[PDB]
UniProtKB/Swiss-Prot annotation:
It comes from Homo sapiens. Changing A79T: In a cutaneous neurofibroma from a patient with neurofibromatosis; somatic mutation. This is Neurofibromin truncated. Disulfide bonds: none annotated. Changing H379R: In mismatch repair deficient cancer cells. Changing Q234P: In a cutaneous neurofibroma from a patient with neurofibromatosis; somatic mutation. Signal peptide: none annotated.
Length: 399
């Protein structure tokens, strides 16, 4: 109360009041009983006046005052998230009294935003935390007419929901799969336009990096693909993996290439593998892995990999995980057997591309690729051993 009085001492003009408002709201929240009483004293007159100012500016009836009030009310929502969900204490009610205005301000497509990304994400995360069922703003964000900034903000919201968040009354990553189909509809709608004016391209590239980091955070967000049975598979988990693979050769944007490569490694974990095909995960796994191995090998033999070192490193990791999953399957079910061990089997052709590209690497005029192309030999011997008795019946030169 004393700090509030001192701050209200500095209510000089629109600028001073706007600056104070962010602290004034916080100080008001620091006093619960006072906030309760203001709704119903002369000692409480200035605080009731301040709330008015805020709401007034918020109602859009100057621009600076409105922006400061919106920022303060976003802070209100964030604090109310830290406020007890079970014990609302009309703090949630006080927030909801202005939440409508905030939503009609930030989440209005026609109305311009204010910077916008940070506040928008904060508001969306807070709204989800308090109200997970009331996903109206999110549903608005899944709209073609909605701006790419809307999409970027929504991606950031989902990510930070999946990213660091106190295990409080805060909801979890669940209650967001209702829009998973549309979620993968959007990265398809992007269709990687850069490879597929400048402001739009830059926005698309940043949005692409954001979705990639999202997939880093959670695979399950997009992997809900029950559509994949036949040709729909090429528009499914397979399409996802394929589109992601096509980023690695891309020299236009290297950071997204590293992110996409790491994301492929992440989704390649057996846990993530099981989340691909409910019917026969082993077969779809092996086929899609062969597809991507094909593409990578053709690109490597094409010899336009200016970052061939990192690519080969990642490919070693992919092979390691492929063999680990093969071991898991074989120990689970010994017989994989008829899908590459007996057009020829896709796995055989993929392994041929593998060995061809591995013999290519020992010829690379670099120096660090040597051990890269030798560890991969070791793992190719390991996978043949796991699949099996003479090991030379598969790779005669195993020695």
């Amino acid at each position: 109360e004393k700090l509030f009085d001192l701050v209200d001492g500095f209510a000089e003009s629109t600028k001073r009041k706007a600056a104070v408002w962010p602290l004034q709201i916080i100080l008001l929240i620091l006093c619960p009983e006072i906030i309760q009483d203001i709704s119903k004293d002369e000692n409480n007159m200035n605080k009731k006046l301040f709330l008015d100012s805020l709401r007034k500016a918020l109602a859009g009836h100057s621009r600076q005052l409105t922006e400061s009030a919106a920022i303060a009310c976003v802070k209100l929502c964030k604090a109310s998230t830290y406020i007890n969900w079970e014990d609302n204490s009309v703090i949630f009610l006080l927030v909801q009294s202005m939440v409508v205005d905030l939503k009609n301000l930030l989440f209005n497509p026609s109305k311009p935003f204010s910077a916008d990304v940070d506040l928008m994400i904060d508001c969306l995360v807070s709204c989800f935390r308090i109200s997970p069922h009331n996903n109206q703003h999110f549903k608005i964000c899944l709209a073609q007419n909605s701006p790419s900034t809307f999409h970027y903000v929504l991606v950031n919201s989902l990510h930070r929901i999946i990213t660091n968040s106190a295990l409080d009354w805060w909801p979890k990553i669940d209650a967001v799969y209702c829009h998973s189909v549309e979620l993968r509809n959007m990265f398809g709608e992007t269709l990687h336009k850069a490879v597929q004016t400048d402001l739009e391209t830059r926005s698309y590239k940043y949005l692409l990096l954001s979705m990639v980091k999202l997939i880093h955070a959670d695979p399950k967000l997009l992997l809900c693909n029950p559509r994949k049975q036949g040709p729909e598979t090429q528009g499914s988990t397979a399409e996802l993996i394929t589109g992601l693979v096509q980023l690695v050769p891309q020299s236009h944007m290297p950071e997204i290439a590293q992110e996409a490569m790491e994301a492929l490694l992440v989704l390649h974990q057996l846990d993530s593998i099981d989340l691909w095909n409910p019917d026969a995960p082993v077969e779809t796994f092996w086929e899609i892995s062969s597809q991507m191995l094909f593409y990578i090998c053709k690109k490597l033999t094409s010899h336009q990999m200016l970052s061939s070192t990192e690519i080969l490193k990642w490919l070693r990791e992919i092979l390691i995980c492929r063999n680990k999953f093969l071991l898991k399957n074989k120990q689970a079910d010994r017989s994989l057997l008829f899908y590459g061990v007996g057009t020829p089997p896709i796995c055989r052709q993929a392994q041929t591309k593998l060995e061809v590209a591995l013999y290519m690497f020992l010829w690379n005029p670099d120096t660090e690729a040597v051990l890269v192309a030798m560890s991969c030999f070791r793992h190719l011997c390991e996978e043949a051993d796991i699949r099996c008795v003479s090991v030379h019946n598969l790779l005669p030169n195993y020695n």
